[PDB]
């Protein structure tokens, strides 16, 4: 009583989920220091 383990299990019934389904939510957090960028997309570096 008044002493509960603070964790619970979701479950995700196989097909009973309309808003009750596993949604593997990957989140990208884009961190820039105005430093050397390092992860940037496929641009062709033309001459200067």
């Amino acid at each position, epitope marked *: 009583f008044n002493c509960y*383990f603070p*964790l*619970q*299990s979701y*479950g995700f*019934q*196989p*097909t*009973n989920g309309v*808003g*009750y389904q596993p949604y593997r939510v990957v989140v990208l957090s884009f961190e820039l220091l105005h430093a050397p960028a390092t992860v940037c997309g496929p641009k062709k570096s033309t001459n200067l």
Partner: antibody, heavy 126, light 111 residues
Framework: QVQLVQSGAEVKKPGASVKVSCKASGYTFTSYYMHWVRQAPGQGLEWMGI????????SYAQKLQGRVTMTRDTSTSTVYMELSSLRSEDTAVYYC????????????????????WGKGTTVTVS | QSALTQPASVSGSPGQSITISCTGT?????????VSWYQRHPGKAPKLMIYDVSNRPSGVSNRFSGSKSGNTASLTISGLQAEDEADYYCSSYTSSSTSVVFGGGTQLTVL
């Protein structure tokens, strides 16, 4: 009188397939799950997999690939248990088990509470 | 995971209290709150007394209590009798390949 009944015992030799039933009584057959536990000789109790009376969706233990297919009958409230390519250790007492909550929408309570039981049904394979 | 660890056999006396240990993995007992115990009267069916570690079905005598810490689950029988002599199996949900694990079992012999 909510009670679960399988068939009698079976006597198999290796490589066959076996048919185990389990009828239900005293409740709404489409609400709870049907869990299945055996007892290998000398080692403890062992769950296969389950089937939903609402839709028939199946699943089972990885160690039991292709050697098990669980079927059911809503009209007679009977659920059926299959085990092919039988081996010597398949000698076990096979139980049918009912989940301790009704299938509920948007649910939280987990559906592996094993609370309602069959008499038991021993398999003999040699 | 693998089968849980239970004592092979524990003896005692009527009215005295005996406790039964159940060790597993952090993925068997320590990650979850889902420990349930069972008993075997010889030649009979299982019977559930323990589930939700310390919670109970209706009709189980207040003599049996369950406890939880670390990798250890435990069952305590207060006010023992020859009425209590049976086999005892702890059960838990696992966060791995399987879903349910059982202990090796414990025979409680009343002397």
């Amino acid at each position: 009188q909510v009670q679960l009944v399988q068939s009698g015992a079976e006597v198999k030799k290796p490589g066959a397939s076996v048919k185990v039933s389990c009828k239900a009584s005293g409740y709404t057959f489409t609400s709870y799950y049907m869990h299945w536990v055996r007892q290998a000789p000398g080692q403890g109790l062992e769950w296969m997999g389950i089937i939903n009376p609402s839709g028939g969706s199946t699943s089972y233990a990885q160690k039991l690939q292709g050697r098990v297919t669980m079927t059911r009958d809503t009209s007679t409230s009977t659920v059926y248990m299959e085990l092919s390519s039988l081996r010597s250790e398949d000698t076990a007492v096979y139980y049918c088990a009912r989940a301790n909550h009704e299938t509920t929408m948007d649910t939280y309570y987990y559906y592996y509470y094993m609370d309602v039981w069959g008499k038991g049904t021993t398999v003999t394979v040699s | 995971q693998s089968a849980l660890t239970q004592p092979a056999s524990v003896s005692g006396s009527p009215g005295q209290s005996i406790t039964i240990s159940c060790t597993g993995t952090s993925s068997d007992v320590g990650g979850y709150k889902y420990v349930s115990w069972y008993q075997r009267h010889p030649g009979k069916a299982p019977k559930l007394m323990i589930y939700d570690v310390s919670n109970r079905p209706s009709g189980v005598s207040n003599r049996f209590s369950g406890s939880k810490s670390g990798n250890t689950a435990s069952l305590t029988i207060s006010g023992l009798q020859a009425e209590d002599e049976a086999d005892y199996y702890c059960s838990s949900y696992t966060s791995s390949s399987t879903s349910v694990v059982f202990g090796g079992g414990t025979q409680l012999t009343v002397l």
